Structures are given as structure tokens and as C-alpha cells.
């Protein structure tokens, strides 16, 4: 819903990118702000503007981008400094899988020799699909949509952890956000929003958790489609297409 994102832009004082057929929710939110009747969640969202102005100095020169236009720059989001926790796990998975390729190939060769046993040679050793077993981990690891997947999975994990921690214990009202600053990207994760600042080109993105989940699963789907098309001999051209 465009209304939710427009409301997030209009709660904390930021420029309004969107235009809408009926800006009723924006008028309602502005009226609530003027008379100071904001809810608890809206107040918690609004209080982050002070932190944003304290950390980021030249916040007034950033330009925020709407949802459809930012997709080109958000399907490939690489933040190398924050995905140092899932990389180790994926590397260990690669190692523990590489320890089984020989046995897996022998198993499939035995099964195929039992099911269709020709009496005149025709060994199954030189089969393309069987020979591509030994490079599944290599193909996933050296993929184009791997780093954006890692970054988005880390972002989703942090946001979901914060959201779950809010439910169990709301006592720690003071600090619920997660802040990560770098010479490239400035990332703020809140159980209700994600704010990304690109400082080299002065761009800003403010997204809802729904957009977080959408981008995460879309990038995961792209990664899986591309890699699994690369492996299969019948879909090698479909990979590049």
C-alpha cells in the first residue's frame, strides 16, 4: 500500500516524494501531529528524527526516491561490512557438502545402472548431469545474485529479531533501533522501517517491512533461478536469457 509509505515519510519531517489520488491519510496524520495525538507506534517512529539529525549532519541535501524507481538500485544492494555472520555459515555448508560429491555420484551411477542396464558397454561415467554434481556449491557461491542475497538476508534477520524482541519485552523503550554507519552506506533498522543512506551519490531510501520481505524473497528467487539454470544442461541458454 502506497499510503503506509507516504505516512512513514510524513510522520517524521522528511520531503514527500509520493503523489496520490487521495491524500486523506497524509492530512489525517498532519492533523494528528499538530494536535499531538500520535499513537505509541507513531510516536516511536517519529522520535527517530532526532537520532537521524544527530548522526547524519548534511541530511538536508539528500533526495529520497519513490518505491518503483528505487528497485533498480535496491535489487543489487551490497553492504560488505554487515554480512560477516552468514558468510561463515555458508562457507561451512559449502565445505560439508563438498565432502559428499564422490559418494553422491557413485550412488546415482549405481541407481542408473540398475534401472537401465544395457549389456553392451555404454558406461554412465561420462554423463553431463552426473558430472555437474561436483560443482553445485561452486556455482551457488560464484553467482551474480549472491552478495545482494546475503545483505538482504542479514537485514531481514536483524529486523525480524527486533520485531520479535518488541513483542516479548517492551520494557527497553529507550533503544530498539539498530544503527550501522560506514563510509559507503548508513543503515538504520527499526521494527517499523528501514532507512538506507548512500553518501557517495546522496540518495535515501525509506522502506516498510513488507518491502523488506518482498525484496529479500525476490532476490532469493533470482539467485536460485539463475544458479539452477546454470547447472542444468538443458537450461544453460535460459540462464543467460
Amino acid at each position: 500500500v502506497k499510503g503506509k509509505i507516504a505516512q512513514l515519510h510524513t510522520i517524521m519531517s522528511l520531503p514527500q516524494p509520493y503523489d496520490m489520488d487521495d491524500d486523506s491519510i497524509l492530512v489525517i496524520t498532519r492533523q494528528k501531529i499538530k494536535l499531538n495525538k500520535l499513537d505509541k507506534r507513531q510516536r516511536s517512529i517519529r522520535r527517530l528524527k532526532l537520532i537521524l539529525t544527530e548522526k547524519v549532519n548534511d541530511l538536508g541535501k539528500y533526495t529520497f526516491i519513490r518505491y518503483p524507481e528505487m528497485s533498480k538500485e535496491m535489487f543489487k544492494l551490497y553492504i560488505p561490512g554487515i554480512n560477516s555472520k552468514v558468510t561463515e555459515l555458508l562457507l561451512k555448508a559449502d565445505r560439508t557438502y563438498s565432502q559428499m560429491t564422490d559418494g553422491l555420484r557413485d550412488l546415482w551411477i549405481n541407481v542408473l545402472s540398475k534401472l537401465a542396464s544395457k549389456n553392451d558397454g555404454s558406461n554412465y561415467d561420462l554423463n553431463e548431469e552426473i558430472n555437474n554434481i561436483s560443482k553445485v556449491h561452486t556455482t551457488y557461491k560464484s553467482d551474480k545474485w549472491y552478495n545482494p542475497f546475503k545483505t538482504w538476508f542479514t537485514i531481514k534477520y536483524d529486523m525480524r529479531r527486533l520485531q520479535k524482541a518488541r513483542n516479548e519485552i517492551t520494557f527497553n523503550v529507550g533503544k530498539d533501533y539498530n544503527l550501522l554507519e560506514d563510509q559507503k552506506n548508513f543503515l538504520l533498522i527499526h521494527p517499523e522501517l528501514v532507512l538506507i543512506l548512500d553518501k557517495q551519490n546522496y540518495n535515501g531510501y525509506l522502506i516498510t517491512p513488507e518491502l523488506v520481505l518482498m525484496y529479500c524473497d525476490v532476490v532469493e528467487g533470482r539467485w536460485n533461478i539463475s544458479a539452477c539454470a546454470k547447472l542444468d544442461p538443458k537450461l544453460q541458454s535460459m540462464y543467460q536469457k
Binding site: 552468514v86 555459515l89 555448508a93 557438502y97 559428499m100 559418494g103 557413485d106 550412488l107 549405481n110
Partner: protein, 144 residues
């Protein structure tokens, strides 16, 4: 198999569930050939494998236990597993299910604490939520 291994690692190391202890994590990560065993052993006998290779050809396999044990034999014949793995699977410990639980799912072996999440939710709803209700149907059906 590879995606199942990745899922196992992610769930055991990078999940928001706070009930996972460090003991389980550093027992599965440090012990030799434990994640491979967990990902390869068919789950009908205790593992985390939900794809019998017979499913790749036919849809209705039959009772999953027979397919699981056939796949275990195939694994140990292809040097993926060991004979001791099959011996341990044969000599594991039984659960504590009853006759009604057996009737609710006949193909199941007596795996300890094998009840599904949906089964637990259904049991909780039947025994707690729908006990005292004004609806004639539920009042007649769900007694104490």
C-alpha cells in the same frame, strides 16, 4: 540435499529462536560427520531428509519407512553413510505414544516427541478453547 544442508546451518546458527542453546550448536558443528548424517538420514527413522529418491520417479511411494530404510541401504552401499549408522537407527529408543495417537497416523514409527506443530495446535484447540461454548454443535461434541 545442498539446500537442506544450508537450511540446517542457517537454522542452527542464525535464527531468532531464543530456545536454541550454545551446547547444541557447538555439539553439531564440532563433532565429526554430524551435519552430514543429519541431512542424509531419512527423517522417517529420525533424520532431517524429506526427499526419498524414489519420489523423483513415482508420486505415491507407499509407506515412507520402507523407502527410508531402502535409501539408508543405498547410502551405506555408496559410502555416504556407515554400517554403524544403520545399527544405531535400528537400536534407537522408542517414544511414548498411545493407541489413539497410533490410529491418528498409522504409518508413523514411535519416534519420541514426533508430534507436528499443527497436531499440537489442534489438540490444544480441542481440549481448551472449544470446551465450554454456547453453540449446540460444539457443546454436543466437545465434552470434558
Amino acid at each position: 540435499i545442498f539446500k537442506n544442508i544450508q537450511q540446517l546451518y542457517i537454522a542452527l546458527g542464525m535464527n531468532i529462536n531464543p530456545t536454541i542453546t550454545q551446547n547444541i550448536k557447538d555439539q553439531y558443528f564440532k563433532n565429526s560427520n554430524w551435519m552430514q548424517y543429519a541431512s542424509l538420514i531419512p527423517a522417517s527413522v529420525g533424520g532431517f531428509n524429506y526427499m526419498a529418491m524414489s519420489r523423483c520417479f513415482v508420486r505415491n511411494i507407499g509407506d515412507p519407512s520402507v523407502a527410508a530404510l531402502a535409501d539408508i541401504k543405498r547410502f551405506i552401499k555408496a559410502n555416504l553413510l556407515d554400517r554403524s549408522v544403520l545399527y544405531r537407527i535400528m537400536n534407537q529408543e522408542p517414544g511414548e505414544s498411545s493407541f489413539l495417537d497410533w490410529a491418528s497416523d498409522p504409518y508413523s514409527c514411535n519416534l519420541p516427541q514426533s508430534q507436528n506443530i499443527t497436531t499440537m495446535i489442534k489438540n490444544i484447540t480441542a481440549r481448551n478453547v472449544l470446551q465450554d461454548s454456547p453453540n449446540p454443535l460444539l457443546s454436543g461434541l466437545f465434552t470434558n
